[PDB]
């Protein structure tokens, strides 16, 4: 990825921060794909997460090529979801979502999945040809038992709004999260170590 | 505890980061009790950390009291230690020492213990009277097998010098930490979740 044009198809600042801290230089182009994929159409939660990441990266890759006839070398897509009791939780639409989300997560152990799509692009015969490599990472997170008072003070904090499941593991969410089991950067929004292992296999 | 005077008996920036982000208003008064306790005098590594956290907070309490003869209401002390194969790792003494702790932790799993002492004070009868609550938190951490040029470049960073085991969690772009099993903020240096639950048992 040394001399290649890397595009990250997500406006999530925590994702950019993770990849910026790792040394990766990239362009930020948020995707216009809106995640209305039928969740019931997938066998596993991480299947829905990986396919969503694929579609977000492909929409960005095609929009860019259609705009100025240049194929970006790599487009990276990602989608972070939360599963508790088999149900899929994404980012809240408001607070009545965020509160009921944290209401469901209170006192249980849930799974965080991030599906990642690495899209290699090239242009051939006036068409954008794409090679997609998908992977996911799972991290188990355990919430403490949360009173409806602290549930509400955290709902209100503005924190839950653009986080999967309506919470983070830094800042105010540390009063909610009791333990983390697995890759913690996966919970923030990006599985960095798995992402690195996927690069060396795609090249060596 | 919403109208009291709170003091953090530690100079670690991450420790004040975690509690400031939680909404706690407090003063930072570094303790001048040095972590010189006899390890062989304890049965467990967490007993050592808790007592070390205890004396460090008790030193600040006495120092604040002898200066003003009015007690700070609550003094918080903490001591983070790392154990790998039974050996206790604390803050390193120079760059080659931190280099050594990283290469022993490289590629394998270790334990992170943070003992915390909450010292309730009162100065009503013209004397410092204390009542201390001790607890600890354990998190298992696994490191990647990272290259050596990278570990010494992390050592010449100055980053390992103020941290137990010679590492922060953002070490090497977030690539050093492979996985986490237990409280996440415990690895950063303060078990915030356990700390808030310890406050509710002290008051209600
Ligand atoms: Cl499903
Ligand atoms: Cl896991
Ligand atoms: Cl709690
Ligand atoms: Cl002991
Ligand atoms: Cl011991």
Give a quick set of tags describing it.
204 residues, elongated, homodimer, alpha/beta, Probable bifunctional dTTP/UTP pyrophosphatase/methyltransferase protein (chains A, B), 6 helices
Description:
2 copies of one chain form a homodimer. Chain A is an alpha/beta fold and 204 residues long. The first copy, chain A, has one domain. Helices cover 34% and strands 28% of the residues of chain A. In chain A, strands 1, 2, 3, 4, 5, 6 and 7 form a 7-stranded mixed β-sheet that branches. In chain A, helix 3 crosses helix 4. The first copy, chain A, is elongated. The two termini of chain A are 13 Å apart. Strand 7 of chain A pairs antiparallel with strand 7 (177-182) of chain B. The site of one chloride ion (CL) has 5 residues of chain B, from helix 2. Chains A, B: Homodimer. Chains A, B: One of its GO terms (cellular component) is cytosol. Chains A, B: Residues 2-204 are annotated as: MAF-like.
Q: Kindly state the percentage of residues in helix of chain A.
A: 25-40%
Number of domains of chain A: 1
**Rg from Cα of chain A:** 18 Å
User: What is the H-and-E element order of chain A?
Assistant: EHEHEEHEEHEHH
Kindly name the structural category of chain A: alpha/beta
PDB class: cell cycle
Keywords: asmtl, cell cycle
Assembly: dimeric
Entry title: Crystal structure of Maf domain of human N-acetylserotonin O-methyltransferase-like protein soaked with TFBQ
């Amino acid at each position: 990825l040394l001399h290649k044009r890397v595009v990250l198809a997500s406006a999530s600042p925590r994702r950019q921060e993770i990849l910026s801290n790792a040394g990766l230089r990239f362009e930020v182009v948020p995707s216009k794909f809106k995640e209305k994929l039928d969740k019931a159409s997938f066998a596993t939660p991480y299947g829905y997460a990986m396919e969503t990441a694929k579609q977000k990266a492909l929409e960005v890759a095609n929009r860019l090529y259609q705009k100025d006839l240049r194929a970006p070398d790599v487009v990276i897509g990602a989608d972070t979801i939360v599963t508790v009791g088999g149900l899929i939780l994404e980012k809240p639409v408001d607070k009545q979502d965020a509160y009921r989300m944290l209401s469901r997560l209170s006192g249980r152990e849930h799974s965080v999945f991030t599906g990642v799509a690495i899209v290699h692009c090239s242009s051939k015969d006036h068409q954008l040809d794409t090679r997609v490599s998908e992977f996911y990472e799972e991290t188990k997170v355990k919430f403490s038992e949360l009173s409806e008072e602290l549930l509400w003070e955290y709902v209100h904090s503005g924190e839950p709004m653009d986080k999967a499941g309506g919470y983070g593991i830094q800042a105010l969410g540390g009063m909610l999260v009791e333990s983390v089991h697995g890759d913690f950067l996966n919970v923030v929004g990006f599985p960095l170590n798995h992402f690195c292992k996927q690069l060396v296999k795609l090249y060596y």
